[PDB]
Amino acid sequence: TAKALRAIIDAARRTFKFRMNKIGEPGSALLDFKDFYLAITTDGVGTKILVAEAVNKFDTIGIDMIAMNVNDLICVGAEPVALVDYLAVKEPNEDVFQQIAKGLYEGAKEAGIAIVGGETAVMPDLINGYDLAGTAVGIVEKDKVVTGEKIKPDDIVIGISSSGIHSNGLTLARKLLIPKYGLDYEYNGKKLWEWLLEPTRIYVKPILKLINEVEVHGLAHITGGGLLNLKRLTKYGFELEMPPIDGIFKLIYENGVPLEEMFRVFNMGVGFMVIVPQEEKENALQILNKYYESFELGKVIKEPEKIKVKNYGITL
Amino acid sequence: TAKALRAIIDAARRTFKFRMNKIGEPGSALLDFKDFYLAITTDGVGTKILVAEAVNKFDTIGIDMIAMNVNDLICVGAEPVALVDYLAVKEPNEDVFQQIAKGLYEGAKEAGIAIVGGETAVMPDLINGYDLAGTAVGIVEKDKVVTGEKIKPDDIVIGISSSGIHSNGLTLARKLLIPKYGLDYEYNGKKLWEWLLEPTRIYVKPILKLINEVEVHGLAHITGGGLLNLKRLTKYGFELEMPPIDGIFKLIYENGVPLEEMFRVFNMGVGFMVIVPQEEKENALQILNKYYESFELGKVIKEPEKIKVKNYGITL
C-alpha cells in the first residue's frame, strides 16, 4: 500500500512550485494567506461505517468524520471554520441519509463549524455500501502556530481522555474480535458493535479555550499511530505513565496484540495530549477538566526521541 | 435520489449559525475572511473512472477531477489556490497510482494550483474499483465577486469551446451507447472509449486573464445542466446560436435523445461562457482566443428567464 501511495504524494509535492510567490502558497497543510495561515485537512471514517451498516445505526458516523478533521486542525493551533463532505453511496436510502445528517449536525455543533458544501455521488457500479469523507479548513495567525519547537525538557504532558476507536485500530479490532465473538457479544456492559461504533471525541472547545488562556508548547491528536503522534512533536524524549488498559483495549490486548503495538495503534485511553510548561500544569488541568477528564501523563526529558512508558516497561 | 439528499443539505444549512459573527462565516460556497472571500468547492469524477478501468488508462482522470473543481471556483471570479484529493480504492495498484498521479500533476499545472493534501483509503470491503474526488479552495476580493447581477440586456454572451464530457452526461452516454456499439467502436476518427474518457477542459488561465483585462458581468461553467448553468446567472433571458451538433453529441442525438434534453444535459460544444458588455466583445474574444477557440454566442434580452436557441427552435 505504501509503495503505491508514494506516487501520489511525490506528484503533489511537485505542484508546490505552482504557488511560489503567490497567495496561498503551502508551507494539516498550512497555506500562506499573508494575514494568516489557512489550515486544510482531509480524512474519511474508514471501515467504522461497516459496523454502522451492520446494525443500521448511522447517526454518529458523521461525528467521527468531523472529529478526525477538526482534531487535526487544532493540532497546529488552528481554529476550525468550515467543512465539506464527500458521500459516496450504492443506493440513496432516505432513512440512512437522515441518520447521517443528524451526526453531521451534532459534530458541527461541537466543533463550532459550518458545513458549507460537499458532493453526494450515487454510483452503484462503484460503491457497495456507504463511504463518508470530508475536508476541513481552519485559520491560525502566523505567530500562533503550535509547531512543538518550544517543547523543552521538564515540560509537562497532559492527556485528555478519549471516547471511541480510530480507523486504523478499528481494522485490527474488527478483524481480531468479530469472528471470535460476534457483534452481539456483551463485554463489560456494552455490546461489541457499540465498542466499535462509539464515535471518537471532538476536542475543539477545550483546546481553543486552553490556547486562549494558557502558554502551550505542543498539541498532539492521538489518532492513527498512538503515542507515535507525540513523538513527531519534538526531538526530545518523553517519560509517561499511561492510564491502565481498560475497556475494549483490554479485550484486544487479552486477544494477543502485544503491549508495544497497542500504544502504536490505539489511543489507549488518551485521545489528545497537550504540552505546557511545568508552571502551567494546574492552570491547564483546571481549564481542560471543565470539558473532559484531563490528567497529568508525564514529562519531556533530555534523552532524545524515545518514549518511556514507566508503569509498563515499554519504549517506543 | 433527490429526496434523500435534501436531508444532508438541510442539515448543513442549519450549521451556518455556528459561524455567526465569526471568521469564515458562509454567505462555490463563499467564506467571509474579512480581507477576502474564500471559495470552496467539491466534486468527484463519477463514472468516467469506469471507462478508465475498462481500458487501463488513468492518466487523465485526475485532469477531470481538478477541472470540475477549479472551473467552479472561477465561476465567481475566484483564483484557484489549492486542492486536496480523496482516493478510495479496492486495491493499491502501483501502476494505476502512477497513472493517476500524472493527471493530477498536469491538471494542477494548467490550473496553477498546489495539491496540498488528501487521503487514500484502501477499503476492499467498500470499493470495487477506484473512486477519485477532491476539494478546491480559491480566493476572491469582496468587491470582485462575479455574481451575474451586473448582467443587463444587450450584453454579449461568448462561449469557449469544450473538450470532454461531464459526469451527468457520461452516465447517459455509457448507458445509451456502450451496449449498442461497444467501447471499441470507431466513430468519426476516435474510438468510443476515447470519446467517453477524453478529459474536460481547464479554463483557469484564460478566465483569470480575462477578468484582469476586461469588464466581466457573468461567468458560467457549462457543467451538469447544460445551458441551465447560464440561466441561473440572471433573471433576464438569452438569445443564442449554439454551434452545430458535432462529435460524440451527434451520435447521442442520432440515438434518440431529444434536442431539448441535449442542451440540458451535455455541454454541446461550449464548456464555459462569459458575459461582457457589447463594447468589450472584440477585447474579450481576442484575449480568450490566445488560449482556446472562443466565439460569440448570443445576447441577453429583455423577456425574462427563457433561453431561446435561435438556430434550433428550442426554448429552455
Ligand SMILES: [Cl-]
Ligand atoms: Cl477523531
Ligand SMILES: [Cl-]
Ligand atoms: Cl484508537
Ligand SMILES: [Cl-]
Ligand atoms: Cl470540468
Ligand SMILES: [Cl-]
Ligand atoms: Cl458534457
Ligand SMILES: [Zn+2]
Ligand atoms: Zn515560497
Ligand SMILES: [Zn+2]
Ligand atoms: Zn483516515
Ligand SMILES: [Zn+2]
Ligand atoms: Zn487524521
Ligand SMILES: [Zn+2]
Ligand atoms: Zn419517504
Ligand SMILES: [Zn+2]
Ligand atoms: Zn501577533
Ligand SMILES: [Zn+2]
Ligand atoms: Zn512558552
Ligand SMILES: [Zn+2]
Ligand atoms: Zn480522535
Ligand SMILES: [Zn+2]
Ligand atoms: Zn515563573
Ligand SMILES: [Zn+2]
Ligand atoms: Zn503560570
Ligand SMILES: [Zn+2]
Ligand atoms: Zn491550586
Ligand SMILES: [Zn+2]
Ligand atoms: Zn452573519
Ligand SMILES: [Zn+2]
Ligand atoms: Zn459531480
